């Protein structure tokens, strides 16, 4: 097995999405509710608990976003030293 190549000269060395764009934590809860209605029915009693969990989602506040990741700043410092150059 070979080793990682040395990147050619790029206009800019950076990652598109520095911070992980996490998903809405409740879109998974809704899928569970929609899963019960398919197996247990709509007006059934088994799905009475998952519905309460779904109603608990929107009543809770949205977590605040995290501070930006400084990865792109450090990638731009070591570009010329880590790759074959920088394109003009």
């Amino acid at each position: 097995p070979n080793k990682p190549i040395r990147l050619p000269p790029l206009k800019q060395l950076r990652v598109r999405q520095a911070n992980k764009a996490e998903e809405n934590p409740c879109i998974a809860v809704m899928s569970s509710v929609l899963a019960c209605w398919a197996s247990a029915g709509y007006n059934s009693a088994g799905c009475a608990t998952v519905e309460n969990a779904l109603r608990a989602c929107m009543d809770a506040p949205k977590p605040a976003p995290k501070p930006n990741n400084t990865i792109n700043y450090h990638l731009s410092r070591f570009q010329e030293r880590l790759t074959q150059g920088k394109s003009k």
Binding site: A40, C47, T49
Partner: protein, 224 residues
């Protein structure tokens, strides 16, 4: 050619010509720059010329079309072979910190390896054995192995006294009311405790992730 035209080596020639005559023909030239007469007799040095570099090792005689003639060569001494032998037989000798920072570059003025391993200005290290070995192997005509054993044995007897003095120096100090602080054996263990806890918290918080995600793997949300 992306590079620019640097004429730094011709500042005097260019400046002296511009100052020879006056732009207003018919008048004497003005006074030249103050630096023109300063470097009048200090021309630049030749640059960019590729000479035949110093050959620290004999070049390959069998080569008929040798390449890399204008490439600097590796510096190798007879001690390189000796250093590698010693430090491979004593790997933990590399754990003894050594200061390669120079003080005044005058260390080799007080080194007379005909006396022994203990010199002036340098510590007793694997380098002393290599220098003492090289001296015996060249002056007293000893062989690589014979000179190695001699300088090597002299080096052990000195290290033994250094370790025996730490223990005795601490033992006698307490016999006359001398107390000391914490030692590495104790300090080293406390640092492990503080680091072990950080792992325990991580494991305890990381195991809850698997057991929770594992139990929730099944779609038992119906609550039948």
């Amino acid at each position: 050619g992306k590079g620019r035209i640097f004429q730094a080596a011709k500042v005097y020639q260019r400046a002296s010509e511009a100052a020879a005559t006056n732009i207003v023909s018919g008048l004497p030239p003005r006074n030249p720059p103050l630096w023109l007469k300063a470097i009048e007799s200090i021309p630049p040095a030749e640059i960019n010329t590729r000479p035949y570099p110093i050959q620290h090792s004999p070049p390959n005689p069998r080569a008929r079309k040798p390449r890399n003639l204008f490439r600097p060569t590796k510096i190798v001494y007879p001690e390189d072979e000796l250093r590698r032998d010693f430090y491979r037989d004593h790997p933990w000798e590399l754990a003894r910190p050594r200061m390669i920072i120079e003080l005044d570059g005058k260390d080799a003025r007080f080194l007379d390896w005909s006396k022994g391993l203990r010199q002036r200005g340098i510590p007793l290290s694997g380098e002393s054995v290599v220098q003492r070995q090289l001296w015996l192997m060249e002056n007293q005509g000893m062989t690589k192995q014979e000179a190695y054993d001699k300088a090597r044995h002299e080096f052990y007897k000195l290290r033994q006294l250094e370790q025996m003095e730490r223990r005795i120096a601490v033992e006698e100090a307490r016999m006359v009311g001398g107390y000391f602080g914490k030692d590495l054996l104790t300090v080293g263990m406390e640092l492990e405790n503080k680091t072990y806890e950080s792992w325990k918290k991580w494991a305890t918080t990381e195991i809850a992730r698997q057991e929770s995600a594992r139990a929730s793997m099944y779609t038992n949300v119906v609550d039948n």
